[PDB]
Design a protein around this nucleic acid. Sequence first.
DNA 1: TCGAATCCTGGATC
DNA 2: TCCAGGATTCGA
Length: 1118
Amino acid sequence: SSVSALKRLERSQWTDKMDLRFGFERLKEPGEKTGWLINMHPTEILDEDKRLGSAVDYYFIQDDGSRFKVALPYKPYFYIATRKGCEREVSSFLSKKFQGKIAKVETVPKEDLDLPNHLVGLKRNYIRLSFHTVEDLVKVRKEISPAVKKNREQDDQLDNIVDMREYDVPYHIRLSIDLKIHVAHWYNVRYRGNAFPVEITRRDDLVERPDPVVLAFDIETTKLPLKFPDAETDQIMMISYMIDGQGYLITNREIVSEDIEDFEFTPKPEYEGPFCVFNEPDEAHLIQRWFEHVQETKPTIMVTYNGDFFDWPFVEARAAVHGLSMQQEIGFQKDSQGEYKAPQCIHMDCLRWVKRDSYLPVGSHNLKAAAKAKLGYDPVELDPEDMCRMATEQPQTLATYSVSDAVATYYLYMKYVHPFIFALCTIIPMEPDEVLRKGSGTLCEALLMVQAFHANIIFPNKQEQEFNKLTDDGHVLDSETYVGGHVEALESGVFRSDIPCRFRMNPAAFDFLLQRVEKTLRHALEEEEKVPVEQVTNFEEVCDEIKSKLASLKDVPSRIECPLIYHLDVGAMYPNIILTNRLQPSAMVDEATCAACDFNKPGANCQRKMAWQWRGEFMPASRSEYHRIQHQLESEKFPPLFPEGPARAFHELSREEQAKYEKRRLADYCRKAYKKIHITKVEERLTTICQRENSFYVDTVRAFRDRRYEFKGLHKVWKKKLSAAVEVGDAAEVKRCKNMEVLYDSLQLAHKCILNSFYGYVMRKGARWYSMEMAGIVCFTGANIITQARELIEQIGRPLELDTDGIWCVLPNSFPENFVFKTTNVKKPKVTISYPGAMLNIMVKEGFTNDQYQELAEPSSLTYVTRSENSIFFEVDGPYLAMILPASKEEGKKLKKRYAVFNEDGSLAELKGFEVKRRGELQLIKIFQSSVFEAFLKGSTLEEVYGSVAKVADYWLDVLYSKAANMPDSELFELISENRSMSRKLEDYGEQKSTSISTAKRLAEFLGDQMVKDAGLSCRYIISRKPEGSPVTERAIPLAIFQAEPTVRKHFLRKWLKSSSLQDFDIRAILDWDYYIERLGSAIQKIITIPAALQQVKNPVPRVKHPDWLHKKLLEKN
DNA sequence: TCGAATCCTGGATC
DNA sequence: TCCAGGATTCGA
Ligand code: SF4
């Protein structure tokens, strides 16, 4: 171990060497300094006693370019419980047993959560242990844990030690929790000298923030035609990097036909950067010149795009050929988890953020689309085939293409990413790297621990999953879940602000509105506005108008009228529900606990109970039969992980094989023994939610809720101040106000994201605070509110669409919608209020409001308040110009969200369900889809809308029948092809056949075994016809064949069809034309014809026929 | 002959 | 990280 420690000291020395190369010279001198706490790492440090001890390492940057590092020693600890009266004796045992291997032992009382008679104020002991090094702590934990395990199986001296807690918190987190240290604040640090620890203090009077230098790059390489490049055999053609707004380019003049002149490029005036070209006589000197320039630049942050698959692996695999090592020059390296990470600068990557937090629709994640959407311009693309040749004949064009991804990457990172990561990281104590890479699961627990810590609460141990949980009746379960909410389209069609439609409204329904109007408007003012009604100058006038309009509604219960459209949305419903009932993961107490809580006395108001729906899924085997098969397994013998190891009795096996062996044998038992093997069961359970557990969780959510609204307020203020800076045009003020605006914008979004995360954690597998019932109560009662709204709205008018958290609906144009009250209050003389909002925000109030909120008055008194609180509110979006909602071809099928809607300005304001296509898609259908939406804006009434549609939709179906011979021949390939690409290598597929596999086979005879010989394949193909009735999987032929030499093309065409005598050989004859007509027929069916028939319009295309079921229904009804 | 139940493999921006 | 889509098997 001493040699291992010496190796760790060598690692330390090497890291100090690199930090010196990057100017992160350690602090040595007594004094105080101020700086920005950019990054931190763990490292172990030798003390003045020459004992190696664990430490953490903090990196700072000044307001100038100077930089420094400081290190803190701090001994980790973990807790063990005890049986009664053991603590002193057990302490003497441990200190005898582990002398020199534990540093200190201590007795501390703590707030348990599960201790009976909890809230009277009792608490239990724990023992704290302290260690010099994490190695020794690990080794002692490995020794200790089995002795607890044996006791839990029962549930010398070690038999008395019962439990242990917080044994697995990452060490570099621990410090930040204990010392309140957090990143991207300003800090002030003083070093007294080695006789003292460093003293470190947070600032909060400084808000202006420094700017780190930022660099990004991209790399362009050779490849061989029709395969992926080889890390060992391909070579580099050009490399380009953008830094602080200046572009640099380098290129391989041994490959490029001519050297490149320095030039300039800008897609939009925002994106300023020009470029400059270095040039070199050989490839190796490219990489040497790169590493020299980056060493001289010594930049702190380094942004790439998808740094896993390609770039760093490539530059590494072509370092060794010339004896280079970036792991010496820059000091980057791979790590056990697979990614690249480095001692002193942090590798950062937009793609993780795009995946995790963009909310862009699926399949738009491809770089060009994401850039276009966020940055608002179209970057241009060349086919990766053509680019390799183009190098030979027009270099300037290739350089002008390749440069673009530098600019796009740099500005994407700066404008969107860089405000977000640090701002969010101001709240949550991890490193800027982990918070970007981590999922939203672990992150929220990494916050929540802070609160649990300062409340002095001992953490629970991880909720490791059980195996084959037995049911209450003794059935073997396989799974459990809460019954979800659902989404469906209630009806389908097209709707517009200006085309007549029909309604029936129940004539008695409006009565239940008109008899409550005044109260409702009172609530609408007093609940939301909080302006006293005594300020209102015209309260009666508007109510009298509304009454008259509701009377006009009652006068004609069924009507022909133009429709409105609105979207009703319960913004952030789930957090509000959690705030509304005092749900806490600790507080869903069982009933048995109320056998002991001294507060459970007659007149107790504190019990509150709610119901949720649970799903079982279980096999039919009875409890005695599982034991009967166990008594068969008791005889059996199994091979261990290596058959060279001794064969194991069932006693010796690990659980993860036992469980599968018994489960499969019980399954094969049932498969014969019972007629059906899985039972699915729904059951309704009633749970009690303890109203008086410690409040810290809800107080956390409340704090975040209110802070978000404060920051949105300040963001609005600063956006106004920015508008004033734009008017004044003073660059200094523009700089200041824009930097404030972006700061608040980022911090506001960050709080939104974390607040949405607060729901998703509590269901996650293995989470520390886990409880199925937290999903149950909140989800079910949430869906229950939607049913109330649906039941209310369907009497007034048809609901079109029913979201997870909202509704789309029509209302009749005559229905009252929006009003202005007038008042004396100079703060707000007149106020606008929307009538559906008032209706919903009163209807929810009567049922949902909570009568049972409680809160503690004085810890020593145990006097408690009673209170009521509510925070569900509906919100109204609309109107919208037009809406389209397609329907699936099948009889009565259910759906998933698919719709579109349009703004009055003609923008496609929202769409959903029209995915960007997984696995690739034909171009023709793509153009058809985007084209047809253009038609719907035109037309007078129902017939004329389709009169517009048909005179565009016909245009393609004519082209396919005609073959449009006038069209240039290459465009058909552009118009019909598929680019489906595959990842395995041919022999990985085995004895199998598929369009891809058959393509892989047929292609090879063009050029040989090379394309099978190495991994992955990419191709383009079309469907052949003449071998009719063999399925399409066999009929595909690769496009490449057309380009081949005429006699070879003849030979293979005469082979691949089994065609004996063919004389005509061109795509016009050979295409399986009408297969693509079927592709068209199966599109145009679902978007147009079915909708048109569903609302009784003539079949809008003679060429296509209704699916037979629809025809038989339509003929029966007419 | 016709309808329902069960077990299986793939998905990642490429 | 499990949902969705097709093929196989059993009942009437
Ligand atoms: S229901 Fe009442 S008595 Fe029972 S644990 Fe909760 S607060 Fe205590």
